[PDB]
Amino acid sequence: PLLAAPLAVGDTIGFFSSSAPATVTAKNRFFRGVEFLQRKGFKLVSGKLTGKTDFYRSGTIKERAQEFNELVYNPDITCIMSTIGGDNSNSLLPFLDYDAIIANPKIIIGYADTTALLAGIYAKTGLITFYGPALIPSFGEHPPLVDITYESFIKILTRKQSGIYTYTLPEKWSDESINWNENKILRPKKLYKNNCAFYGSGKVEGRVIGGNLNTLTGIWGSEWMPEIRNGDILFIEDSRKSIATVERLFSMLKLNRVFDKVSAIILGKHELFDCAGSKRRPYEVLTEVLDGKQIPVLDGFDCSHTHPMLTLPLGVKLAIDFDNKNISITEQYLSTE
Amino acid sequence: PLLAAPLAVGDTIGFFSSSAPATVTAKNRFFRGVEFLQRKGFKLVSGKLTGKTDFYRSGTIKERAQEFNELVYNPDITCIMSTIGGDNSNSLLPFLDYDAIIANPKIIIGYADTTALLAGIYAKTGLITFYGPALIPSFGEHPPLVDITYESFIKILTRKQSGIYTYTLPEKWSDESINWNENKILRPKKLYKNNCAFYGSGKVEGRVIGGNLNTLTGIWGSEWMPEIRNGDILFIEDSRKSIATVERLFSMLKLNRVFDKVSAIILGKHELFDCAGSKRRPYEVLTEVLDGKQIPVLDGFDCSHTHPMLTLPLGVKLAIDFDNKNISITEQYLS
């Protein structure tokens, strides 16, 4: 795979708004996230659509593609970070400068709707991109959870690329929709014990592919959807969906023969899942859809819309040890220097 | 293509609930639809999940597939009609009895989420199915709009298959969200003059393919999504979406090279579209996404979630005459 140079303290991070204009609509949280990273020593470059609005988005399709490309062209930038997702980053894909991305590999990071870009860039260039923090939702989060998000971000992106990396398990997590865009919290979020579950036995190792599942529907079938192959580990997460929608998306995967190929599935914790009174969780729905197909599942990985969020390279090998209840990166995912 | 026998007054219609359990949650409207069709002379057979609930759906994936299959096996049924959509009919696709459908073709009709079944059945069997009324939303509608829906349903499904069929244009329509499952009429729905527009010139003729666009995402990429081919007319409609979602779905089509293949696009009227204060309509968003590609578009065809609803065969040739502002079926679609 094509690898970006690693991050280091003091580096320059550029940020872009490929969909929702949250630098305007969540400006307090945006400023808190900016200050958070600056205090860590990072220099920030603001994408050209910062502070702009076109109703539901930051600008036209072409304006948004230009904003992103301009960060790729900047030789001082080590990391290109999404401000926030939305719905519309898939529109940009025909207009990204893939040749420039290949010539100037950088760490590209975000989540949610930005999956369309992470997956599309990988499909076109082979660059290992990252499912991880976006500036506003992730780094504008109030303590204590933001510190745990940051610890994973800095560990994954700055560590020496020698030997496997085994993920830590956050002690507590939350998905509450409070404390969004004001100076002070209303009240502390509920902190849940980590209820991640490992369904299966033994160890499965394979290339991880995926992201936000609902977002993948916007690139599915196209040259921008990475081909899923025998032995891959599928990583999928969704946010604020009804159980009805979750069944639909799992059945989409089934119809596409994905469950005939993959050797394991990672479900990210689902933010504020709506079970419609059934008390069912997503894993139970997946089990029905699987129709007897035995695939081991890591249910509740902390790489999703819940807080805190771990950073995950996409398109490299992971090993899930179902017996020891852990998950590791086993393939180099950044340049050694 | 594989063609079903035409409908006749007095035939038996069977109904099924492949997703939302609205025979329970919209029972008043359900009864209105049943009574409406019975008064027209039809006999109705209730699918086995009628009156059942499993929270957000009518039953398990397998039981829903069985409900549908049992209607296919019933020799008395000439039309299989959806009760209502939802989100989940794509789940049934591995379990439908496609061989039985081929062996005794019937009229299969519905819309919205049921697109997954209409499209999947066509992909597997070549059967010409119908984007059209579902029992509860369509035939449980109060007069006067229900009468216009019915007029199209009966015309399309009973007419002799000789010469082209040119659609009538409903004079007025509505998408107002009132008088759903209430027993009394607060008042008639607000009625709007028909604002359908023909963007283009000349005449375009090609096989129509599509349905509810959001629903197509649940079958996309699979063997159940019919291949879109050079010359097709793409028919798409959506309901109650944000402009953000509409842009995403149009861009999905673009990324899939759909706009390099199609000869025209039909946009169904979009029920209660949310433009996020932009004042933009779906056609304007499509125009941006097309990035200069000159595809003629019929914007606002009355085959969608708005009332009244026309009945449209899928998988046969239509001719859109942009100069004369009309649309016709030009290929035989019933036996």
Ligand SMILES: N[C@@H](CCC(=O)O)C(=O)NS(=O)(=O)OC[C@H]1O[C@@H](n2cnc3c(=O)[nH]cnc32)[C@H](O)[C@@H]1O
């Ligand atoms: N959720 C996907 C869209 C795709 C999908 O959901 O299927 C997305 O792109 N989200 S996003 O724009 O990046 O938002 C990221 C996070 O930001 C959170 N968020 C956004 N606005 C608000 C808010 O007003 N209050 C609380 N939380 C908010 C939201 O709960 C989500 O977890």
Ligand SMILES: N[C@@H](CCC(=O)O)C(=O)NS(=O)(=O)OC[C@H]1O[C@@H](n2cnc3c(=O)[nH]cnc32)[C@H](O)[C@@H]1O
């Ligand atoms: N909307 C698609 C799903 C595809 C999608 O929208 O992404 C669908 O399957 N719809 S449906 O379950 O068949 O609903 C059909 C119609 O039923 C109407 N409806 C349902 N419940 C209500 C209600 O409570 N009030 C008013 N109208 C309602 C609504 O206007 C919609 O047009």
